[PDB]
Symmetry: C2
Subunit: 232 residues, 2 copies
């Protein structure tokens, strides 16, 4: 499997025998979906980033308010066999051959996250056609470099060191329910293509048993999942 | 920001469950660059080009970890535990930023060199005969997403602190270790990479950094300098 996906909160702070250089144990996200996708060669970009860079979009539906969202881009994936309970697989990814899945294409991901204009599941597809909301991380956030399995995180402002101090937090400081768009691109000589897995993790405040995010590269299909999600 | 922390197998902490690993105390990151078409140092699986990295370990250790990452991109000013090869330095940024493979097959084989001035010649001889454990022969055929190949002692205690009470004969021996690395098609061993080599010493035992080089003669020069230095 993939490496564990960790929030920015520190669970333990054990100072290693003698050496003042210490070891902080991060708290893992309680709710993680790994989305396995595939960008076919010459596939048109979903959009443009930084003027001229080909960007591709994933859409995430977050149904309750959260403490944090973490996003990791790993590529390529190779074959993974039968997906597990935490895994989702794109059609393109299914149809892709083992060889196709095992070809590397890029390494450093520029990730942008933007909240879209959608108060309700049923606005998702039009929200996707619409401009993002025009503030803090739950409206806009960008990490221009993501290498070696690092994350892009959407955080509340002024987060405490102790995860447990989120018990106290005011609702109005938490990240809002809604539709978020992940844009990803790269730098030459890389190009965004082939297999990849976007791990998305949510952190809920202490005592709130989480719900999993819904994720899809297709806003109509996510919307159906989200429309169906709310009336089940 | 550099590389992820290189972790040993020893569990430092456990809780609510996910476990926190003890880092290696003595770590060196070897930034290298395999030139297009470069002749293999040897063959693996009847159809794979393998490349060799030589590690000298002067004293007994509790564990060694090897992580292979590729490509690296540009890295900025090398830090206090970074070795950077001339090939890597001569490579362009574009060259170091192109990926070429993602799944590494690693072997670690001990070579028959009891002292520094055997190193160069030992590299030319077969590995020590491989039960003999991890510190003679170890292989991990798949290393993806920054996973490690570890050379471990057999029947280790749960608690690292209990290593202070271990019999010496159980610890991993001093010597010359060859790291082989190759890959599966469609990838190929090409371009930039960083091999992170971590040592775990038993507690109370000050770490000594591993000496690492792709050229055994060069490694031998360094091992020799280090040894005669200690008188
Ligand atoms: O062609 C199949 C051989 N295969 C190794 C088996 O996993 C790929 C190596 O390049
Ligand atoms: O296939 C996919 O999932 C994509 O295009 O992002
Ligand atoms: O650059 C190097 O040292 C190599 O190929 O191992
Ligand atoms: Cl010894």
């Amino acid at each position: 499997g993939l490496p564990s996906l960790k929030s920015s909160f520190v669970l333990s702070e054990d100072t290693i025998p003698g050496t003042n250089e210490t070891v902080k144990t991060l708290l893992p996200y309680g709710s993680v979906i790994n989305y396995y996708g595939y960008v076919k060669p010459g596939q048109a970009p979903d959009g443009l980033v930084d003027g001229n860079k080909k960007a591709y979009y994933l859409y995430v539906w977050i149904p309750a308010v959260i403490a944090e969202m973490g996003v990791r881009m790993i590529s390529p994936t190779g074959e993974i066999g039968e997906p597990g309970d935490g895994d989702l697989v794109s059609d393109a990814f299914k149809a892709a051959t083992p060889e196709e899945k095992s070809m590397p294409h890029w390494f450093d991901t520029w990730i942008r996250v933007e909240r879209m204009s959608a108060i309700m599941p049923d606005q998702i597809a039009k929200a996707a056609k619409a401009k993002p909301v025009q503030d803090g991380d739950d409206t806009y956030k960008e990490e221009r470099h993501n290498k070696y399995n690092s994350l892009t995180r959407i955080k509340i402002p002024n987060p405490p060191k102790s995860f447990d101090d989120l018990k106290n937090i005011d609702t109005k400081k938490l990240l809002v329910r809604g539709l978020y768009r992940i844009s990803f691109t790269t730098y030459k000589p890389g190009e965004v293509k082939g297999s990849f897995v976007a791990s998305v993790g949510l952190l809920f405040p202490p005592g709130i048993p989480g719900v999993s995010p819904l994720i899809h590269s297709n806003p109509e299909e996510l919307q159906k999942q989200a429309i169906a999600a709310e009336e089940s």
